[PDB]
Write a protein that binds this ligand. Structure first.
Ligand SMILES: O=C([O-])C(=O)[O-]
Ligand SMILES: [Zn+2]
Ligand SMILES: [Zn+2]
Lengths: 110, 146
């Protein structure tokens, strides 16, 4: 069947027709998402001198090539539409920032 | 990175960590401004603190760069606003989110780590004379963040 939760790498859920996988530590990721994470970690570890689960740090077993072969999920981008209330809150923050500047309370870094 | 950043933005817009906010600087989805209200269990109570967040190209696999813009007296935060916090360096993971990072910084304000300081004089005072330390931290909060 299809899991009801979310992939923590991309923040989207799962749909039939999508390619996804489950780890031995019971965590679900899209195959595409997990492949990107593993590639990055292998690079970092080498520069230091054993890739761990993003969620729980258990060492993973995997075949990177098999994960890479899966199709990337088609996921429409989530439009950003600030509510009326959030716009009001933004205005108040602007007033507070202006006072901090006047006090010499804002770090410049020239 | 962009689809991930849009997902996060919408989730912080509808359910932000208590007393925090975050969103884009103008039109640039990769540069955000955040605010933290000073925790009530800290000498920063009453202050509003601004922070800058810059997302790297390879987000969420590399950490965001987070710094204080508002001046603050703390053993782990220096005069450039740099923050000594493990999850922003050695302990980053893509399971973390900007929402979780703000929560962690709130915790650090309540409870400093003076054995790994960015400011040795402030660490010394925190360890040998806590009364003097909270007095000075309150003094800076009142002058700069209120
Ligand atoms: O920190 C300062 O410079 C002060 O308290 O005047
Ligand atoms: Zn995913
Ligand atoms: Zn796991």
């Amino acid at each position: 069947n299809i899991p009801h939760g979310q992939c923590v790498i991309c923040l989207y859920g799962f749909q039939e027709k999508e390619a996804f996988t489950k780890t031995p530590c019971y965590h679900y990721f899209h195959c595409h998402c997990l492949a990107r994470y593993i590639q990055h970690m292998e690079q970092e570890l080498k520069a230091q001198g054993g890739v761990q689960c993003a969620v729980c740090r258990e060492p993973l077993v995997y075949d990177l090539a098999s994960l890479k072969a899966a199709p990337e999920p088609q996921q429409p981008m989530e439009l950003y539409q600030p509510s009326a209330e959030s716009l009001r809150q933004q205005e108040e923050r602007k007033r507070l920032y202006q006072r901090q500047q006047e006090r010499g309370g804002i770090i410049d870094l020239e | 990175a962009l689809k991930r950043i849009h997902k996060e933005l919408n989730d912080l817009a509808r359910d932000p960590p208590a007393q925090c906010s975050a969103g884009p600087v103008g039109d640039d989805m990769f540069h955000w401004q955040a605010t933290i209200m000073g925790p009530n269990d800290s000498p920063y109570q009453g202050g509003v603190f601004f922070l800058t967040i810059h997302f790297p190209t390879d987000y969420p696999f590399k950490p965001p760069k987070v710094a204080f813009t508002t001046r603050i007296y703390h053993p782990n935060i220096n005069s450039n606003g740099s923050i000594c916090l493990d999850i922003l360096r050695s302990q980053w993971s893509p399971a973390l989110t900007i929402s979780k990072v703000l929560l962690s910084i709130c915790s650090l304000l309540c409870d400093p780590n003076p054995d790994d300081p960015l400011v040795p004089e402030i660490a010394r005072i925190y360890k040998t004379d806590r009364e003097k330390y909270n007095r000075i931290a309150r003094e800076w909060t009142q002058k700069y963040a209120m």
